[PDB]
Amino acid sequence: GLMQFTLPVRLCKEIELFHFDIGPFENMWPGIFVYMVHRSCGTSCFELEKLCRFIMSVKKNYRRVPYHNWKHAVTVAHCMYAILQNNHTLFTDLERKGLLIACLCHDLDHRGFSNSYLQKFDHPLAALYSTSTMEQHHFSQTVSILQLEGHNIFSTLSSSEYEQVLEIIRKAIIATDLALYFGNRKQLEEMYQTGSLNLNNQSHRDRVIGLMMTACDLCSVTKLWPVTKLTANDIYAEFWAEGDEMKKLGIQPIPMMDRDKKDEVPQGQLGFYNAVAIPCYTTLTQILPPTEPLLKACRDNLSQWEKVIRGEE
Numbered sequence: 609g610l611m612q613f614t615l616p617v618r619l620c621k622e623i624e625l626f627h628f629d630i631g632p633f634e635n636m637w638p639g640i641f642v643y644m645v646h647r648s649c650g651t652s653c654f655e656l657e658k659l660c661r662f663i664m665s666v667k668k669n670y671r672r673v674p675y676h677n678w679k680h681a682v683t684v685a686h687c688m689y690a691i692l693q694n695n696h697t698l699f700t701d702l703e704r705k706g707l708l709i710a711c712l713c714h715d716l717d718h719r720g721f722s723n724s725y726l727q728k729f730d731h732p733l734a735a736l737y738s739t740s741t742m743e744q745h746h747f748s749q750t751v752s753i754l755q756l757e758g759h760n761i762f763s764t765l766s767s768s769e770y771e772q773v774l775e776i777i778r779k780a781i782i783a784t785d786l787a788l789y790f791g792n793r794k795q796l797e798e799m800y801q802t803g804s805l806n807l808n809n810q811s812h813r814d815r816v817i818g819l820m821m822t823a824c825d826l827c828s829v830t831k832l833w834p835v836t837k838l839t840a841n842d843i844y845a846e847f848w849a850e851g852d853e854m855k856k857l858g859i860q861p862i863p864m865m866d867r868d869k870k871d872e873v874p875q876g877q878l879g880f881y882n883a884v885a886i887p888c889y890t891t892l893t894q895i896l897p898p899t900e901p902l903l904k905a906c907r908d909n910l911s912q913w914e915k916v917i918r919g920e921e
């Protein structure tokens with residue numbers, strides 16, 4: 609019980625900031641995650657032995673893809689940790705437990721391809737799950753790992769606490785489908801502006817957790833410019849692979865995904881900041897005022913990508 613994870617001093621202090629980068633040392637990532645669980649949730653939330661076996665099974669079911677990998681999983685968890693820590697009193701015990709595990713598991717067994725490519729390939733997962741295809745698969749893999757022997761970190765919840773937390777995790781992971789983000793955010797925008805937003809209404813809580821998930825998942829856009837720029841190479845490495853596979857199906861890919869049209873990246877990042885990221889972190893800052901540094905970092909990086917187009921870098 610009295611066995612704490614501690615971090616070196618620089619990490620101990622920077623982990624508390626939204627723009628923290630987990631660094632290049634893979635073998636420190638499990639311990640950074642447990643560190644985050646203990647401070648967010650408590651040293652009692654999970655049996656450490658179970659939690660470690662769960663984390664190491666989660667890690668093994670992430671593939672070696674340029675972006676949708678174990679490092680993404682941990683990075684997305686860390687954003688959720690910073691959000692929860694700056695909003696201490698707004699979330700229940702079950703929610704903090706659930707949300708850190710959903711972030712860690714939200715892209716399980718990702719092959720680095722969109723739902724659109726699965727549907728055009730005619731992949732078996734597309735006939736199994738017509739909408740949010742990869743995300744119904746990420747939730748399925750999560751449930752599978754929980755049911756391996758000695759991996760059930762929720763075993764000490766009541767039956768009904770257990771069902772609540774798997775329902776928090778399923779909605780949180782489904783919410784990472786960006787096709788669902790647009791409508792969810794518009795709805796939240798309307799409820800905020802007409803002041804009908806009500807955090808004691810479950811349906812409203814679900815929508816706010818959804819937006820937090822989108823915000824955590826996109827958090828590469830909120831890092832210090834050098835991190836955000838180097839991450840965008842991994843992002844585009846996956847898009848260009850997908851574009852290559854589209855061309856093999858006789859389908860010309862959008863220029864963003866076409867590895868002959870790299871010039872069109874900066875403007876494809878601007879479109880993504882203006883159409884997706886800025887509005888996301890704006891609505892989030894309106895409902896959760898302490899997440900304001902995410903919107904500021906995102907505005908800073910939008911401005912860095914504008915500079916890239918203007919030829920200044």
Ligand SMILES: COc1ccc2[nH]c(=O)c3c(C)nc(-c4ccccc4Cl)n3c2n1
Nearest residue numbers: 675786825826827828829840843876877880
């Ligand atoms: C889904 O289309 C895009 C387009 C550009 C980006 N650029 C980014 O910076 C980015 C980041 C940080 N995360 C995603 C993203 C979001 C949802 C699903 C897949 C990805 Cl790659 N994207 C992008 N996703």
Ligand SMILES: [Mg+2]
Nearest residue numbers: 714715742784
């Ligand atoms: Mg995903």
Ligand SMILES: [Zn+2]
Nearest residue numbers: 680714715825
């Ligand atoms: Zn993700």
